[PDB]
């Protein structure tokens, strides 16, 4: 009696006032029995009621209870049950003995849990989702530690994520537009439908589609614009393709291609089928087993640089169900010094922060973990080339000749010409602490030219020569003055 | 003040009554927003179209309650929320016509459960119908999460109390039989399982150490019933009958790929493994906290009075499995022993302290705590000497690893025996000992040599501190 006269009270402010018809749905035996077994059952844990709506000359409100939650039922369109409120009720402990003495003594309040939705509604199950529990599992897993916080986070993430596409996923209006008459229903012309001018409209439609469709479906060099946009792009490329699978998978954009197949006009069905998804799909859908983190342009240590390294070429390993094509050998060696050039960059970034003006310990400390980082992308890029002969093994069909003359030759060039250098600077400034009793004299020469060398060093980009050479120029006869002196 | 009054009656249907301090917050109140660190984001919230939810929170202080959109750290609180639906200030639509109700009161975890296991899985029929239908799959994937975590719960309360994971396997009903996205969900879900029963079943001593650094007979005893009730609740969800029937339709569906996986790479008891039966031979045990004591009863006597008594109950080896009795297990659990035999003598040096004893009192407490702790030593090595005269026949034979903490935590007492010793021998014989020269060098002898021996000694207990891990050096 009790629980009656709470949920009584819940029913009123939610969507009208309180109604005979409302207590005639408690007074009913059905509704009763379900109440009393919801009560004692540790089986059933959800109450519902339906707030039907009947429309005849006025509008009619009835209310009923059930077992079954059909929420989204009521926001399908076209249906008896259209336009209903629906009433959730839960109860917060399994065990009969402990929802006896809470319904004796504890607050119904407590006692039940209690959920509201809109009827008509097709985003309204992603929004509650979204809205509570993806916002409590993100507060509570930086809150308390827990097992799999972060694989957590990132599932529910996804979730929302899918829930949010699917309810705009809908077809209407690439935008793909069907007929008005046409998103009106489909046999609504029963002789207009064989009309030239209707005809030629779904005719025209479905050319743009299928040009619309083929500009998208016809990629870029595997060798420019860096890995990182390749596979930004290769992501694209699935959602996309996708999202026009599905676009193509709706009814009604089928079903003006059986109007077109009713009427015969062949010249359009059949260039939809033709011209037109299959290999891209299939293409794509073998890329995405990649495991790609932008770890490499967000480090900012060469310790990070590194385990940023095994992390991608660990993650490489998957070079076997992608497909033939985008996973060409040549390709591959493509997105090797696309991968080398985006290292490269990285190299440069936490150079900045400038072995040319720090002393010889942040030179030695650099130098020495930069010698590290390029050992460990020379020996797993050797792992992976074990992987690239992999590749022929089975599929010794083609070939992709070793292209290995990229800008990553010449710069690692560049790195031993720095490596070196600083090292000879190095052990030069402690020869020279050993050689001269004036200490200062010597090191002034030899700082001399190692500043009109750091400073000659503003060419490497552009001119690996320029810099480098002249840096010698200045810096061999220099240092071999000094190797005079060291004679002396 | 519609809004206001409408959450009044959500407050009263879901938390309690409302409260005077909630007919006082009814009106804005700088206070309140201060307390909460928040402005006037629920003004703002029921405009703006970002915001689209808020929380009450049932706070409670020494037994008094209080009542911001984005949740707290919820443990004593019972949290309602309340949640937009597209409208925005629109005031001939009702307010609950505009807003969902829902609570967190409970756990977050086994309300999760309840919330999703009880709701969202068997509405799932007509958007699909509606839609390009692969929202369901989608919402196969949602019923992967919830209830996951919830039995994974049990766990959690075992884990935030202490490494023993209780799985959910989850289970998704199809429309169609033969279809690949629900044979492949339903094939992908129940590889998910072997890799959840992999994870429990490999849970080998070697995995025991990667995941503790002090072991103890006592952690060993209660993870193997623990091995024994996880494995047993794990046969349970795999005999559950819609469990089998998932296998069968995928057997149906000739997705052999994930039947024999399960039968054969999960290490079941039902599964040819055999490795829940080896926990079935191995719940035949009985164990006893003896050694276990923290209090001052575990006196040193009473260490060798434990040490007698176990080394007594050990004698069981004839009659024991001889496979978890094996010579080289065996050494690991004396090597337990041992863990638990220092763990208590450490307890009971820490109030020793002789090192601050008084100059007058030194070396006393030295002594007697010394002795007695290297007759408890020696008794254990005599009777453990009496344990190495057991090496005789079982499935495996292994050389001895018998160099436990308590050898270690032998020299750190070697080095203050041979001080301690030393120090009171030569402050007895000191202070009756002066010279036979004359008596000013006499006393001079006495305030030389005393304070000479204790900058010494006082010098060597410093210096006494890493005999721990380098008796050696110290």
């Not at chain 1, 989204?72 to 003495?101: H, S, Y």
């Not at chain 2, 492949?184 to 995995?207: A, C, Y």
């Not at chain 2, 005999?239 to 339709?249: G, P, T």
């Not at chain 2, 997705?255 to 035949?284: D, H, I, M």
């Amino acid at each position: 009696s009790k629980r009656i006269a709470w949920m009584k009270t819940t029913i009123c402010d939610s969507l009208q006032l309180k109604d005979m018809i409302v207590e005639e749905s408690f007074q009913y035996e059905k509704n009763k029995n379900l109440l009393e077994q919801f009560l004692s059952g540790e089986g059933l844990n959800k109450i519902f009621a339906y707030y039907q709506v009947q429309e005849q000359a006025q509008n009619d409100d009835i209310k009923d209870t059930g077992a079954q939650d059909p929420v989204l039922f009521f926001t399908t369109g076209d249906l008896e049950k259209i336009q209903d409120k629906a009433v959730w009720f839960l109860r917060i402990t399994n065990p009969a003995d402990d929802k006896k003495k809470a319904s004796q003594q504890d607050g119904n309040d407590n006692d039940i849990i209690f959920g509201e939705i809109t009827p008509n509604t097709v985003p309204m199950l992603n929004a509650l989702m979204e809205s509570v529990y993806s916002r409590q599992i993100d507060h509570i897993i930086t809150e308390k530690i827990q097992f799999w916080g972060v694989a957590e986070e990132e599932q529910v993430l996804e979730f929302q994520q899918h829930s949010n596409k699917f309810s705009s996923e809908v077809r209407e209006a690439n935008l793909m537009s069907p007929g008005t008459e046409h998103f009106k229903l489909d046999y609504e012309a029963i002789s207009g439908l064989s009309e030239s001018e209707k005809m030629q409209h779904y005719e025209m439609k479905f050319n743009e589609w299928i040009n619309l469709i083929s500009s998208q479906l016809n990629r870029k060099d595997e060798k420019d614009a860096g890995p990182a946009t390749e596979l930004i792009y290769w992501r694209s490329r699935m959602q996309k393709i996708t999202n026009w699978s599905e676009q193509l998978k709706s009814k009604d954009f089928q079903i003006v291609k059986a109007s077109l197949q009713r009427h015969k006009n062949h010249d359009n069905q059949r260039p939809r089928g033709d011209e037109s998804l299959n290999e891209a799909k299939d293409n794509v859908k073998y890329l995405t087993t990649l495991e790609k983190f932008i770890e490499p342009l967000y480090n900012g240590t060469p310790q990070q640089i590194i385990d940023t390294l095994p992390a991608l070429m660990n993650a490489i390993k998957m070079i076997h169900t992608i497909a033939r094509f985008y996973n060409t050998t040549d390709k591959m060696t493509g997105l090797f010094i696309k991968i080398t050039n985006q290292m490269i960059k990285n190299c440069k970034d936490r150079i900045l922060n400038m072995i040319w003006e720090q002393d010889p310990a942040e030179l030695i400390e650099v130098l020495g973990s930069c010698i590290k980082l390029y050992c460990e992308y020379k020996k797993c890029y050797n792992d992976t080339k074990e992987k690239v002969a992999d590749m022929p093994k089975g599929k010794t069909f083609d070939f992709s000749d070793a292209q290995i003359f990229g800008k990553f030759d010449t710069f690692v060039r560049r790195l031993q010409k720095l490596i070196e250098i600083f090292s000879n600077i190095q052990q030069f400034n402690a020869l020279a602490k050993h050689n001269l009793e004036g200490m200062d004299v010597l090191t002034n020469k030899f700082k001399k030219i190692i500043d009109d060398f750091k400073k000659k060093g503003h060419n490497l980009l552009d001119t690996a020569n320029n810099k480098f050479d002249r840096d010698w120029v200045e810096f061999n006869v220099e240092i071999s003055h000094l190797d005079g002196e060291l004679q002396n | 003040d519609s809004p206001e009054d409408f959450i009044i009656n959500r407050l009263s249907q879901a938390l309690g009554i409302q409260k005077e301090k909630i007919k006082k917050s009814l009106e804005t109140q700088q206070d309140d927003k201060g307390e909460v660190t928040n402005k006037d984001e629920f003004q703002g919230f029921i405009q703006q179209d970002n915001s689209t939810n808020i929380l009450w929170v049932s706070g409670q202080s020494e037994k008094c309650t209080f009542y911001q959109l984005p949740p707290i750290d919820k443990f004593k609180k019972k949290g309602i929320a309340v949640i937009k639906l597209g409208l925005h200030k629109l005031t001939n639509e009702n307010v609950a016509k505009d807003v969902v109700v829902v609570e967190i009161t409970n756990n977050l975890l086994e309300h999760l459960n309840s919330v999703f296991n009880e709701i969202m899985s068997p509405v799932m029929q007509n958007p699909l119908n509606q839609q390009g239908w692969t929202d369901l799959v989608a919402k196969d994937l949602m019923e992967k999460f919830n209830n996951y975590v919830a039995q994974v719960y049990v766990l959690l309360g075992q884990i935030k109390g202490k490494m023993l994971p209780l799985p959910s396997h989850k289970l998704t009903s199809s429309d169609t039989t033969p279809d690949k996205d629900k044979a492949h969900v339903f094939e992908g879900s129940i590889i998910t399982w072997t890799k959840q029963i992999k994870n429990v079943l490999k849970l080998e001593p070697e995995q025991l150490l990667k995941y503790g650094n002090d072991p103890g007979p006592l952690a060993e005893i209660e993870f193997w019933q623990n091995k024994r009730d996880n494995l047993n609740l794990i046969d349970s969800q795999l005999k559950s009958v819609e469990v089998q029937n998932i296998l069968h339709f995928l057997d149906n569906n000739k997705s052999t790929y994930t039947t024999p996986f399960t039968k054969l790479q999960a290490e079941v008891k039902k599964a040819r493994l055999e490795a829940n039966e080896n926990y079935r031979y191995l719940f035949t045990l009985k164990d006893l906290f003896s050694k276990l004591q923290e209090s001052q009863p575990s006196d040193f006597p009473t260490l060798y009075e434990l040490f007698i008594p176990i080394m007594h109950t050990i004698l069981l080896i004839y009659n024991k499995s001889k496979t978890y009795n094996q010579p080289p297990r065996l050494v690991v659990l004396i090597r337990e022993i041992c863990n638990a035999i220092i763990s208590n003598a450490q307890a009971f040096v820490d109030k020793d302290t002789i090192f601050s004893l008084i100059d007058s009192k030194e070396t006393t407490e030295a002594c007697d705590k010394l002795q007695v702790t290297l007759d408890v030593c020696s008794k254990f090595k005599d009777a453990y000497f009496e344990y190495k005269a057991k090496a005789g026949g079982n499935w495996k034979l292994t050389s001895n690893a018998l160099f436990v903490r308590l050898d270690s935590f032998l020299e750190r007492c070697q080095d203050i025996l041979h001080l301690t010793n030393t120090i009171v021998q030569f402050n007895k014989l000191e202070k009756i000992e002066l010279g036979g020269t004359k008596g000013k060098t006499l006393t001079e002898s006495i305030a030389q040599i005393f304070k000479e021996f204790e900058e010494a000694v006082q010098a060597f207990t410093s210096v006494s501190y890493d005999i721990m891990n380098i008796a050696e050096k110290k």
